[PDB]
Amino acid sequence: LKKILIIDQQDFSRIELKNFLDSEYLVIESKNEKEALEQIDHHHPDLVILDMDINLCLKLKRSKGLKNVPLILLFSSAIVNGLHSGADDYLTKPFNRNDLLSRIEIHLRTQNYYSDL
């Protein structure tokens, strides 16, 4: 199973995401920056999903544990202006669960593509 780290301060949405993703992946939850970074050192996830409600993209990207690991940013209702750049993909909230699952699968597939390369 591929590993997905979710970072979200809001417990309700964090749990809704993990419950949804648990059927397909090994899912690690995190509620803040320090937890996230610690989970990265301990588990080295294959993909990271960051909810804006917690430039954290940069910080995570400036981390030796995220090499070749895509970051997906989820944000509510500026990013188009360039703020919080550094992520590999951006989904607005609420997100279509089926579209998220598709992007995740495509990003991991690309990850494998380069691994096999």
PDB file of N, CA, C and O in Angstrom, residues 7-67:
ATOM      1  N   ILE A   7      -2.687  16.350   6.426  1.00  0.00           N
ATOM      2  CA  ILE A   7      -2.385  17.388   7.405  1.00  0.00           C
ATOM      3  C   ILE A   7      -3.595  18.308   7.413  1.00  0.00           C
ATOM      4  O   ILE A   7      -3.861  19.002   6.432  1.00  0.00           O
ATOM      5  N   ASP A   8      -4.327  18.315   8.516  1.00  0.00           N
ATOM      6  CA  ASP A   8      -5.531  19.127   8.601  1.00  0.00           C
ATOM      7  C   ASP A   8      -5.872  19.405  10.064  1.00  0.00           C
ATOM      8  O   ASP A   8      -6.017  18.475  10.865  1.00  0.00           O
ATOM      9  N   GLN A   9      -6.006  20.681  10.407  1.00  0.00           N
ATOM     10  CA  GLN A   9      -6.324  21.063  11.778  1.00  0.00           C
ATOM     11  C   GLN A   9      -7.740  20.685  12.175  1.00  0.00           C
ATOM     12  O   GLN A   9      -7.982  20.265  13.305  1.00  0.00           O
ATOM     13  N   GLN A  10      -8.672  20.839  11.243  1.00  0.00           N
ATOM     14  CA  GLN A  10     -10.068  20.519  11.503  1.00  0.00           C
ATOM     15  C   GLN A  10     -10.289  19.010  11.614  1.00  0.00           C
ATOM     16  O   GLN A  10     -10.153  18.271  10.637  1.00  0.00           O
ATOM     17  N   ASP A  11     -10.632  18.555  12.811  1.00  0.00           N
ATOM     18  CA  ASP A  11     -10.859  17.136  13.032  1.00  0.00           C
ATOM     19  C   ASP A  11     -11.954  16.528  12.169  1.00  0.00           C
ATOM     20  O   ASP A  11     -11.795  15.417  11.660  1.00  0.00           O
ATOM     21  N   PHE A  12     -13.063  17.243  11.992  1.00  0.00           N
ATOM     22  CA  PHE A  12     -14.148  16.696  11.195  1.00  0.00           C
ATOM     23  C   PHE A  12     -13.725  16.384   9.759  1.00  0.00           C
ATOM     24  O   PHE A  12     -13.972  15.285   9.253  1.00  0.00           O
ATOM     25  N   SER A  13     -13.104  17.350   9.095  1.00  0.00           N
ATOM     26  CA  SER A  13     -12.677  17.125   7.721  1.00  0.00           C
ATOM     27  C   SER A  13     -11.494  16.153   7.655  1.00  0.00           C
ATOM     28  O   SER A  13     -11.371  15.374   6.703  1.00  0.00           O
ATOM     29  N   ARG A  14     -10.637  16.178   8.672  1.00  0.00           N
ATOM     30  CA  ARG A  14      -9.484  15.285   8.654  1.00  0.00           C
ATOM     31  C   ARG A  14      -9.936  13.825   8.707  1.00  0.00           C
ATOM     32  O   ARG A  14      -9.410  12.967   7.995  1.00  0.00           O
ATOM     33  N   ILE A  15     -10.912  13.561   9.559  1.00  0.00           N
ATOM     34  CA  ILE A  15     -11.451  12.223   9.723  1.00  0.00           C
ATOM     35  C   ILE A  15     -12.254  11.801   8.504  1.00  0.00           C
ATOM     36  O   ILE A  15     -12.234  10.645   8.108  1.00  0.00           O
ATOM     37  N   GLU A  16     -12.959  12.746   7.903  1.00  0.00           N
ATOM     38  CA  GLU A  16     -13.748  12.433   6.723  1.00  0.00           C
ATOM     39  C   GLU A  16     -12.813  12.048   5.573  1.00  0.00           C
ATOM     40  O   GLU A  16     -13.118  11.168   4.765  1.00  0.00           O
ATOM     41  N   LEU A  17     -11.656  12.692   5.514  1.00  0.00           N
ATOM     42  CA  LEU A  17     -10.715  12.396   4.451  1.00  0.00           C
ATOM     43  C   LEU A  17     -10.100  11.021   4.655  1.00  0.00           C
ATOM     44  O   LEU A  17     -10.067  10.206   3.732  1.00  0.00           O
ATOM     45  N   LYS A  18      -9.607  10.770   5.863  1.00  0.00           N
ATOM     46  CA  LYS A  18      -8.977   9.493   6.168  1.00  0.00           C
ATOM     47  C   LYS A  18      -9.935   8.322   6.016  1.00  0.00           C
ATOM     48  O   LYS A  18      -9.546   7.271   5.504  1.00  0.00           O
ATOM     49  N   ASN A  19     -11.169   8.488   6.488  1.00  0.00           N
ATOM     50  CA  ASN A  19     -12.163   7.418   6.389  1.00  0.00           C
ATOM     51  C   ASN A  19     -12.367   7.062   4.930  1.00  0.00           C
ATOM     52  O   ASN A  19     -12.474   5.892   4.567  1.00  0.00           O
ATOM     53  N   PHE A  20     -12.397   8.093   4.095  1.00  0.00           N
ATOM     54  CA  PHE A  20     -12.587   7.919   2.660  1.00  0.00           C
ATOM     55  C   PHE A  20     -11.371   7.250   2.024  1.00  0.00           C
ATOM     56  O   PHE A  20     -11.508   6.331   1.219  1.00  0.00           O
ATOM     57  N   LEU A  21     -10.176   7.678   2.417  1.00  0.00           N
ATOM     58  CA  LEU A  21      -8.949   7.129   1.837  1.00  0.00           C
ATOM     59  C   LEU A  21      -8.463   5.805   2.426  1.00  0.00           C
ATOM     60  O   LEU A  21      -7.678   5.104   1.800  1.00  0.00           O
ATOM     61  N   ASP A  22      -8.931   5.448   3.616  1.00  0.00           N
ATOM     62  CA  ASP A  22      -8.493   4.204   4.233  1.00  0.00           C
ATOM     63  C   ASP A  22      -8.759   2.947   3.415  1.00  0.00           C
ATOM     64  O   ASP A  22      -8.071   1.939   3.593  1.00  0.00           O
ATOM     65  N   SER A  23      -9.745   2.985   2.525  1.00  0.00           N
ATOM     66  CA  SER A  23     -10.043   1.795   1.725  1.00  0.00           C
ATOM     67  C   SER A  23      -8.995   1.502   0.662  1.00  0.00           C
ATOM     68  O   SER A  23      -8.833   0.357   0.242  1.00  0.00           O
ATOM     69  N   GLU A  24      -8.276   2.539   0.247  1.00  0.00           N
ATOM     70  CA  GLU A  24      -7.275   2.422  -0.809  1.00  0.00           C
ATOM     71  C   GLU A  24      -5.807   2.551  -0.376  1.00  0.00           C
ATOM     72  O   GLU A  24      -4.915   2.007  -1.026  1.00  0.00           O
ATOM     73  N   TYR A  25      -5.538   3.275   0.704  1.00  0.00           N
ATOM     74  CA  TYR A  25      -4.145   3.455   1.092  1.00  0.00           C
ATOM     75  C   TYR A  25      -3.844   3.341   2.578  1.00  0.00           C
ATOM     76  O   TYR A  25      -4.733   3.218   3.411  1.00  0.00           O
ATOM     77  N   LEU A  26      -2.556   3.370   2.888  1.00  0.00           N
ATOM     78  CA  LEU A  26      -2.106   3.348   4.269  1.00  0.00           C
ATOM     79  C   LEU A  26      -2.162   4.840   4.572  1.00  0.00           C
ATOM     80  O   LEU A  26      -1.378   5.610   4.015  1.00  0.00           O
ATOM     81  N   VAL A  27      -3.085   5.250   5.439  1.00  0.00           N
ATOM     82  CA  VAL A  27      -3.257   6.665   5.739  1.00  0.00           C
ATOM     83  C   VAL A  27      -2.829   7.163   7.120  1.00  0.00           C
ATOM     84  O   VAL A  27      -3.308   6.678   8.154  1.00  0.00           O
ATOM     85  N   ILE A  28      -1.944   8.161   7.108  1.00  0.00           N
ATOM     86  CA  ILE A  28      -1.424   8.788   8.324  1.00  0.00           C
ATOM     87  C   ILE A  28      -2.079  10.162   8.475  1.00  0.00           C
ATOM     88  O   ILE A  28      -2.127  10.948   7.522  1.00  0.00           O
ATOM     89  N   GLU A  29      -2.601  10.454   9.657  1.00  0.00           N
ATOM     90  CA  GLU A  29      -3.226  11.748   9.872  1.00  0.00           C
ATOM     91  C   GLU A  29      -2.283  12.632  10.689  1.00  0.00           C
ATOM     92  O   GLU A  29      -1.431  12.140  11.414  1.00  0.00           O
ATOM     93  N   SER A  30      -2.427  13.938  10.536  1.00  0.00           N
ATOM     94  CA  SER A  30      -1.593  14.898  11.238  1.00  0.00           C
ATOM     95  C   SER A  30      -2.444  16.153  11.364  1.00  0.00           C
ATOM     96  O   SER A  30      -3.201  16.471  10.454  1.00  0.00           O
ATOM     97  N   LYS A  31      -2.329  16.870  12.477  1.00  0.00           N
ATOM     98  CA  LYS A  31      -3.143  18.067  12.666  1.00  0.00           C
ATOM     99  C   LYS A  31      -2.362  19.374  12.588  1.00  0.00           C
ATOM    100  O   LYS A  31      -2.957  20.446  12.453  1.00  0.00           O
ATOM    101  N   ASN A  32      -1.037  19.294  12.676  1.00  0.00           N
ATOM    102  CA  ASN A  32      -0.213  20.502  12.580  1.00  0.00           C
ATOM    103  C   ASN A  32       1.159  20.234  11.961  1.00  0.00           C
ATOM    104  O   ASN A  32       1.532  19.085  11.722  1.00  0.00           O
ATOM    105  N   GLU A  33       1.899  21.312  11.713  1.00  0.00           N
ATOM    106  CA  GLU A  33       3.231  21.264  11.110  1.00  0.00           C
ATOM    107  C   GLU A  33       4.219  20.329  11.809  1.00  0.00           C
ATOM    108  O   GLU A  33       4.886  19.520  11.157  1.00  0.00           O
ATOM    109  N   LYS A  34       4.326  20.437  13.129  1.00  0.00           N
ATOM    110  CA  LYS A  34       5.262  19.582  13.855  1.00  0.00           C
ATOM    111  C   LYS A  34       4.862  18.114  13.779  1.00  0.00           C
ATOM    112  O   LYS A  34       5.715  17.249  13.590  1.00  0.00           O
ATOM    113  N   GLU A  35       3.576  17.820  13.932  1.00  0.00           N
ATOM    114  CA  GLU A  35       3.150  16.432  13.823  1.00  0.00           C
ATOM    115  C   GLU A  35       3.539  15.929  12.430  1.00  0.00           C
ATOM    116  O   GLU A  35       4.219  14.906  12.293  1.00  0.00           O
ATOM    117  N   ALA A  36       3.111  16.670  11.410  1.00  0.00           N
ATOM    118  CA  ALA A  36       3.383  16.327  10.016  1.00  0.00           C
ATOM    119  C   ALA A  36       4.855  16.004   9.778  1.00  0.00           C
ATOM    120  O   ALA A  36       5.182  14.930   9.274  1.00  0.00           O
ATOM    121  N   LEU A  37       5.738  16.932  10.141  1.00  0.00           N
ATOM    122  CA  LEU A  37       7.171  16.730   9.967  1.00  0.00           C
ATOM    123  C   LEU A  37       7.638  15.482  10.705  1.00  0.00           C
ATOM    124  O   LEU A  37       8.498  14.744  10.215  1.00  0.00           O
ATOM    125  N   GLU A  38       7.077  15.227  11.880  1.00  0.00           N
ATOM    126  CA  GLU A  38       7.473  14.032  12.614  1.00  0.00           C
ATOM    127  C   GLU A  38       7.001  12.777  11.891  1.00  0.00           C
ATOM    128  O   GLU A  38       7.716  11.787  11.819  1.00  0.00           O
ATOM    129  N   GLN A  39       5.790  12.818  11.353  1.00  0.00           N
ATOM    130  CA  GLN A  39       5.266  11.660  10.642  1.00  0.00           C
ATOM    131  C   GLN A  39       6.105  11.412   9.409  1.00  0.00           C
ATOM    132  O   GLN A  39       6.296  10.266   9.008  1.00  0.00           O
ATOM    133  N   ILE A  40       6.620  12.491   8.819  1.00  0.00           N
ATOM    134  CA  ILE A  40       7.449  12.357   7.638  1.00  0.00           C
ATOM    135  C   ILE A  40       8.747  11.664   8.009  1.00  0.00           C
ATOM    136  O   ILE A  40       9.179  10.760   7.308  1.00  0.00           O
ATOM    137  N   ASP A  41       9.373  12.070   9.111  1.00  0.00           N
ATOM    138  CA  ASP A  41      10.620  11.423   9.509  1.00  0.00           C
ATOM    139  C   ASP A  41      10.379   9.956   9.848  1.00  0.00           C
ATOM    140  O   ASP A  41      11.175   9.094   9.494  1.00  0.00           O
ATOM    141  N   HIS A  42       9.274   9.663  10.524  1.00  0.00           N
ATOM    142  CA  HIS A  42       9.011   8.280  10.891  1.00  0.00           C
ATOM    143  C   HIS A  42       8.482   7.377   9.793  1.00  0.00           C
ATOM    144  O   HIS A  42       8.864   6.214   9.727  1.00  0.00           O
ATOM    145  N   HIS A  43       7.653   7.901   8.897  1.00  0.00           N
ATOM    146  CA  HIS A  43       7.063   7.045   7.879  1.00  0.00           C
ATOM    147  C   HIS A  43       7.384   7.288   6.404  1.00  0.00           C
ATOM    148  O   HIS A  43       7.101   6.430   5.567  1.00  0.00           O
ATOM    149  N   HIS A  44       7.952   8.444   6.082  1.00  0.00           N
ATOM    150  CA  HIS A  44       8.267   8.781   4.696  1.00  0.00           C
ATOM    151  C   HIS A  44       7.116   8.465   3.737  1.00  0.00           C
ATOM    152  O   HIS A  44       7.228   7.588   2.877  1.00  0.00           O
ATOM    153  N   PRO A  45       5.997   9.196   3.861  1.00  0.00           N
ATOM    154  CA  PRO A  45       4.832   8.985   2.998  1.00  0.00           C
ATOM    155  C   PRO A  45       5.102   9.196   1.501  1.00  0.00           C
ATOM    156  O   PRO A  45       5.989   9.962   1.115  1.00  0.00           O
ATOM    157  N   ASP A  46       4.317   8.517   0.664  1.00  0.00           N
ATOM    158  CA  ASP A  46       4.484   8.612  -0.775  1.00  0.00           C
ATOM    159  C   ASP A  46       3.771   9.833  -1.339  1.00  0.00           C
ATOM    160  O   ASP A  46       4.117  10.333  -2.398  1.00  0.00           O
ATOM    161  N   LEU A  47       2.780  10.325  -0.609  1.00  0.00           N
ATOM    162  CA  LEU A  47       2.061  11.490  -1.062  1.00  0.00           C
ATOM    163  C   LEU A  47       1.553  12.229   0.171  1.00  0.00           C
ATOM    164  O   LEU A  47       1.239  11.611   1.190  1.00  0.00           O
ATOM    165  N   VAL A  48       1.506  13.555   0.081  1.00  0.00           N
ATOM    166  CA  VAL A  48       1.070  14.389   1.189  1.00  0.00           C
ATOM    167  C   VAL A  48      -0.095  15.245   0.741  1.00  0.00           C
ATOM    168  O   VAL A  48      -0.069  15.783  -0.356  1.00  0.00           O
ATOM    169  N   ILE A  49      -1.107  15.371   1.594  1.00  0.00           N
ATOM    170  CA  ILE A  49      -2.271  16.189   1.293  1.00  0.00           C
ATOM    171  C   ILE A  49      -2.318  17.246   2.373  1.00  0.00           C
ATOM    172  O   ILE A  49      -2.440  16.938   3.556  1.00  0.00           O
ATOM    173  N   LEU A  50      -2.219  18.503   1.971  1.00  0.00           N
ATOM    174  CA  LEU A  50      -2.212  19.574   2.940  1.00  0.00           C
ATOM    175  C   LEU A  50      -3.438  20.451   2.856  1.00  0.00           C
ATOM    176  O   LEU A  50      -3.771  20.975   1.795  1.00  0.00           O
ATOM    177  N   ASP A  51      -4.126  20.595   3.978  1.00  0.00           N
ATOM    178  CA  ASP A  51      -5.263  21.479   4.000  1.00  0.00           C
ATOM    179  C   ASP A  51      -4.779  22.869   4.497  1.00  0.00           C
ATOM    180  O   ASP A  51      -4.086  23.002   5.491  1.00  0.00           O
ATOM    181  N   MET A  52      -5.135  23.907   3.762  1.00  0.00           N
ATOM    182  CA  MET A  52      -4.758  25.276   4.105  1.00  0.00           C
ATOM    183  C   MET A  52      -5.186  25.756   5.487  1.00  0.00           C
ATOM    184  O   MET A  52      -4.582  26.655   6.059  1.00  0.00           O
ATOM    185  N   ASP A  53      -6.228  25.162   6.037  1.00  0.00           N
ATOM    186  CA  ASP A  53      -6.686  25.602   7.341  1.00  0.00           C
ATOM    187  C   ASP A  53      -5.683  25.433   8.468  1.00  0.00           C
ATOM    188  O   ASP A  53      -5.955  25.860   9.588  1.00  0.00           O
ATOM    189  N   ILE A  54      -4.525  24.837   8.203  1.00  0.00           N
ATOM    190  CA  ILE A  54      -3.548  24.680   9.281  1.00  0.00           C
ATOM    191  C   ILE A  54      -2.622  25.892   9.403  1.00  0.00           C
ATOM    192  O   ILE A  54      -2.883  26.948   8.824  1.00  0.00           O
ATOM    193  N   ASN A  55       4.128  29.730   4.536  1.00  0.00           N
ATOM    194  CA  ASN A  55       3.938  28.835   3.400  1.00  0.00           C
ATOM    195  C   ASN A  55       4.383  27.445   3.810  1.00  0.00           C
ATOM    196  O   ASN A  55       5.545  27.075   3.643  1.00  0.00           O
ATOM    197  N   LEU A  56       3.450  26.669   4.350  1.00  0.00           N
ATOM    198  CA  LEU A  56       3.776  25.326   4.801  1.00  0.00           C
ATOM    199  C   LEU A  56       4.206  24.389   3.685  1.00  0.00           C
ATOM    200  O   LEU A  56       4.886  23.393   3.949  1.00  0.00           O
ATOM    201  N   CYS A  57       3.813  24.705   2.449  1.00  0.00           N
ATOM    202  CA  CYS A  57       4.203  23.890   1.299  1.00  0.00           C
ATOM    203  C   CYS A  57       5.714  23.933   1.242  1.00  0.00           C
ATOM    204  O   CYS A  57       6.378  22.908   1.155  1.00  0.00           O
ATOM    205  N   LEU A  58       6.232  25.155   1.271  1.00  0.00           N
ATOM    206  CA  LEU A  58       7.660  25.423   1.241  1.00  0.00           C
ATOM    207  C   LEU A  58       8.375  24.621   2.313  1.00  0.00           C
ATOM    208  O   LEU A  58       9.251  23.813   2.008  1.00  0.00           O
ATOM    209  N   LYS A  59       7.993  24.854   3.565  1.00  0.00           N
ATOM    210  CA  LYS A  59       8.589  24.156   4.695  1.00  0.00           C
ATOM    211  C   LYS A  59       8.669  22.646   4.462  1.00  0.00           C
ATOM    212  O   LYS A  59       9.725  22.043   4.651  1.00  0.00           O
ATOM    213  N   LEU A  60       7.557  22.037   4.046  1.00  0.00           N
ATOM    214  CA  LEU A  60       7.536  20.597   3.790  1.00  0.00           C
ATOM    215  C   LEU A  60       8.456  20.266   2.618  1.00  0.00           C
ATOM    216  O   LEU A  60       9.176  19.263   2.638  1.00  0.00           O
ATOM    217  N   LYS A  61       8.429  21.121   1.600  1.00  0.00           N
ATOM    218  CA  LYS A  61       9.255  20.954   0.406  1.00  0.00           C
ATOM    219  C   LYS A  61      10.733  21.182   0.734  1.00  0.00           C
ATOM    220  O   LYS A  61      11.625  20.678   0.049  1.00  0.00           O
ATOM    221  N   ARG A  62      10.984  21.941   1.790  1.00  0.00           N
ATOM    222  CA  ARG A  62      12.341  22.239   2.214  1.00  0.00           C
ATOM    223  C   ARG A  62      12.783  21.137   3.183  1.00  0.00           C
ATOM    224  O   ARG A  62      13.752  21.290   3.931  1.00  0.00           O
ATOM    225  N   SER A  63      12.067  20.017   3.153  1.00  0.00           N
ATOM    226  CA  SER A  63      12.357  18.896   4.039  1.00  0.00           C
ATOM    227  C   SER A  63      12.928  17.666   3.339  1.00  0.00           C
ATOM    228  O   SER A  63      12.441  17.243   2.288  1.00  0.00           O
ATOM    229  N   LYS A  64      13.973  17.103   3.940  1.00  0.00           N
ATOM    230  CA  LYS A  64      14.625  15.909   3.420  1.00  0.00           C
ATOM    231  C   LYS A  64      13.810  14.695   3.867  1.00  0.00           C
ATOM    232  O   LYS A  64      14.101  14.054   4.885  1.00  0.00           O
ATOM    233  N   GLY A  65      12.771  14.407   3.094  1.00  0.00           N
ATOM    234  CA  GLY A  65      11.889  13.291   3.374  1.00  0.00           C
ATOM    235  C   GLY A  65      10.751  13.394   2.379  1.00  0.00           C
ATOM    236  O   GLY A  65       9.910  12.502   2.270  1.00  0.00           O
ATOM    237  N   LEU A  66      10.744  14.505   1.645  1.00  0.00           N
ATOM    238  CA  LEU A  66       9.728  14.772   0.643  1.00  0.00           C
ATOM    239  C   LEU A  66      10.268  14.805  -0.787  1.00  0.00           C
ATOM    240  O   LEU A  66       9.619  15.327  -1.696  1.00  0.00           O
ATOM    241  N   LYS A  67      11.455  14.240  -0.990  1.00  0.00           N
ATOM    242  CA  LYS A  67      12.032  14.194  -2.327  1.00  0.00           C
ATOM    243  C   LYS A  67      11.241  13.202  -3.169  1.00  0.00           C
ATOM    244  O   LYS A  67      11.098  12.038  -2.807  1.00  0.00           O
TER     245      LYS A  67
END
